[PDB]
Structure 1
Amino acid sequence: FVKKHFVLVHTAFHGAWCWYKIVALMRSSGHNVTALDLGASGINPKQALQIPNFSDYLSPLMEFMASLPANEKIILVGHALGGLAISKAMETFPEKISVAVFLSGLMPGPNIDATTVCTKAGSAVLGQLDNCVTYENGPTNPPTTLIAGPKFLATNVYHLSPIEDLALATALVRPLYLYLAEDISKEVVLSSKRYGSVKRVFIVATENDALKKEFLKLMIEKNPPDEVKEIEGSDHVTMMSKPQQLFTTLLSIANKYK
């Protein structure tokens, strides 16, 4: 047994709360774990319209990374959209990261920019079922924020999760500011000497969706991780639908990747 320090990063609309089952499992196993709320997420004080710049959204993780003690290194886990966040962290504090885990996360790199990963990622969310957007820059300009609907969550996100988790999420999801893919690419700049220096592990956790898996496969090709693992039977929120398997997998990764 070696005490590890896990740092968990949620995806769009979510917050630190979505990892509650994982956090409980890590803590009861004696490990340290930090689940951050990104800007305007969970109980972060900012509202969507107050953080129009991507850096504002990533602020919480970046500040936490900067306060990490000297010797300490962590297992940085990014979920879906959260991959962009941990990517920025890897580039900024490479020495502080033992291993980075992209749980179905947007994993941009030199051969596949944030514009490609985000355009496709948002592809399966925008204009889906009961989702809806706002227009702060006039109804004539691109949408300002994206709000996830109850139906969308039930049928596309939590479809393989306990019903109470859908209910939990329905009461907690918050709007996502629609950051410009350009703003994003200027914010997330990766180099081989830093980002590329961090051990990287990708976890495929997609179910009954070829196109989506083809997307994940595409990213893996363009920006080859150190390892690819897989979890089966998961919906979009693995920490909700396959908690024990995810925990087991993260523990394994933390143990072998010193």
Structure 2
Amino acid sequence: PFVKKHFVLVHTAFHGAWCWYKIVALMRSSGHNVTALDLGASGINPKQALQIPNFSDYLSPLMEFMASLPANEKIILVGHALGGLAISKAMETFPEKISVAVFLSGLMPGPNIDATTVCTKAGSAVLGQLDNCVTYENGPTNPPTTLIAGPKFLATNVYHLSPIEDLALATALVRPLYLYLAEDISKEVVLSSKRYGSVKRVFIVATENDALKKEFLKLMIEKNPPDEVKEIEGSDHVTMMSKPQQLFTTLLSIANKYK
């Protein structure tokens, strides 16, 4: 008996709703509702990175979407990598509107491994990697302002197991990420046991992820245990690109289990 669900997808750094296109097609084709959002200055969001130095504005598209969700409608919230921070805040604020939260290789901070610990670790795996670079729109006296993903970094660390056209698509769409201050993130993403902790949570491991190392991911899983950990073999960092059908099937299974 077909039970219509509402999947809400949240991209990682530099990306946008566009990266989910294969997943969105499978969802809409099977009759489910799906909303792929562009966070601040991501995808075709009108804001420019330099215009939104506050993490609050990076996350606003999701928070605003969450706030206007209809009465009693519950969603399957999916966050990829950095998107993990966004859905975490959504979990703390609107825990009742989320049937189950899914972290796809996502930054998954919790009361005992906070957002800043997690962001500091994440930053080390992206800043300075291959051809990635930063800008100083506020002068040499201030912290770098934005991070720009390089094509070689994308091909090697992110899309190494995906169709080459997807790499081409990414290089024509990735945008800069404002380097939000740890202090700002810490005040925005604060999680509690009775709110964030009350939302069903599943973590999906990308077996061949060369962007976010195993040790970091298992540190988060260890210190902020999810209700379940699932795995997708042969997937690079962007599972929605390299292993779309498997991610789709897994998502449907997760939605049915926790509905």
Shorter-chain TM band: over 0.9
Residue 141 (structure 2) pairs with residue 162 (structure 1): no
* Superposition deviation, residue 211 in structure 1: 7.8
Residue aligned with 2:53, SS:
coil
Q: Matched residue pairs, number? A: 258
SS in 1 for 2:8: strand
1:65-90 deviations in whole A, cap 9, x for unaligned? 01100021000000000000000000
**Aligned partner of residue 212 in structure 2, secondary structure:** helix
Q: For residues 134 and 210 of structure 2, what CA distance do their matches in structure 1 show? A: 25
Tell me, yes or no, if the aligned pair for 2:115 and 2:190 is still in contact at 8 Å: no
Other structure's SS at 1:217 match: helix
Contact 1:104–1:204 (CA<8 Å) still a contact in 2? Answer: yes
The answer on whether the counterparts of 2:40 and 2:59 sit within 8 Å (CA) in structure 1 is yes
- CA positional deviation for 1:140: 2.9
Deviation at 1:208, TM superposition (A): 6.4
Aligned-partner Cα distance in 2 for 1:155–1:223: 29
Q: Describe the SS at the equivalent of 2:34.
A: strand
Contact 1:108 1:117 in 2 (8 A): yes
Q: Report if aligned partners of 2:212, 2:237 keep a CA contact under 8 Å in 1.
A: no
Q: What CA distance in whole angstroms lies between the structure 2 residues aligned with 1:162 and 1:133?
A: 28
Moved over 2 A (4+): 208-211
Local SS of the residue matching 1:193 = coil
**What is the CA distance between 1:128 and its match in structure 2?**
1.2
1:43-192 alignment to 2 at 5 Å?
43-192=44-193
**1:179 to partner: Cα distance:** 0.2
Q: Is the 8 A contact 1:206 1:212 kept in 2?
A: no
Q: Which moved more, 1:244-253 or 1:204-213?
A: 204-213
Structure 1 residue 155 displacement after superposition: 1.1
Q: Deviations over 1:146-199 (max 9, x none)?
A: 000111111111111001000000000000000011110100011111111100
Offset, 1:206: 3.6
Cα separation, partners in 2 of 1:165 and 1:181, compared to 1, 3 Å: same
In structure 2, the CA distance between the partners of 1:189 and 1:36, relative to structure 1 (3 Å rule), is same
**CA 1:247–1:211: 2 relative to 1, 3 Å:** closer
Per-residue CA shift, 1:206-250, capped at 9, x if unaligned? 416598111111101111111111111111100000000000000
Q: 1:210 to 1:48 in 2, by over 3 A?
A: closer
Using a 3 Å threshold, how does the CA distance of structure 1 residues 97 and 208 change in structure 2: closer, same or farther?
Answer: closer
Q: What TM-score, normalized by structure 1, do the two folds share?
A: 0.98
Which consecutive unaligned segments of at least 5 residues does structure 2 have?
none
Distance of aligned partners of 1:162 and 1:211 in 2 relative to their CA distance in 1, 3 Å threshold: closer
For residues 28-87 of structure 1, the C-alpha deviation after alignment (integer angstroms, 9 at most, x for no partner) is 111000000000000000000110000000000000001100021000000000000000
Question: Matched residues in 1 for 2:25 and 2:184: separation?
Answer: 36
SS at 2:7's partner residue? strand
Q: Does structure 1 retain, via aligned residues, the 8 Å contact 2:205–2:231?
A: yes
Secondary structure, aligned partner of 1:211: coil
Structure 2 counterpart of 1:28: 29
Structure 1 CA distance for aligned equivalents of residues 98 and 248 of structure 2: 19
Provide the C-alpha distance between the structure 2 equivalents of 1:35 and 1:125, rounded to a whole number of angstroms: 24
For the residues of structure 2 that align with 1:113 and 1:121, how far apart are their CA atoms?
12
Residue 146 of structure 2 contacts residue 177 of structure 2 at CA under 8 Å; is this kept in 1?
Answer: yes
* TM-score computed with the length of structure 2 as normaliser: 0.97
Kindly report the root-mean-square deviation, in angstroms, between the aligned alpha carbons of the 2 structures: 1.2
Maintained 8 Å contact 1:99/1:198: yes
Unaligned runs of 5+ in 1: none
Provide closer, same or farther for how the CA distance between residues 76 and 218 of structure 1 changes in structure 2, counting only shifts above 3 A: same
Separation in structure 2 between the aligned mates of residue 151 and residue 224 of structure 1, nearest angstrom: 34
1:104, 1:206 within 8 Å by CA — same for their partners in 2? no
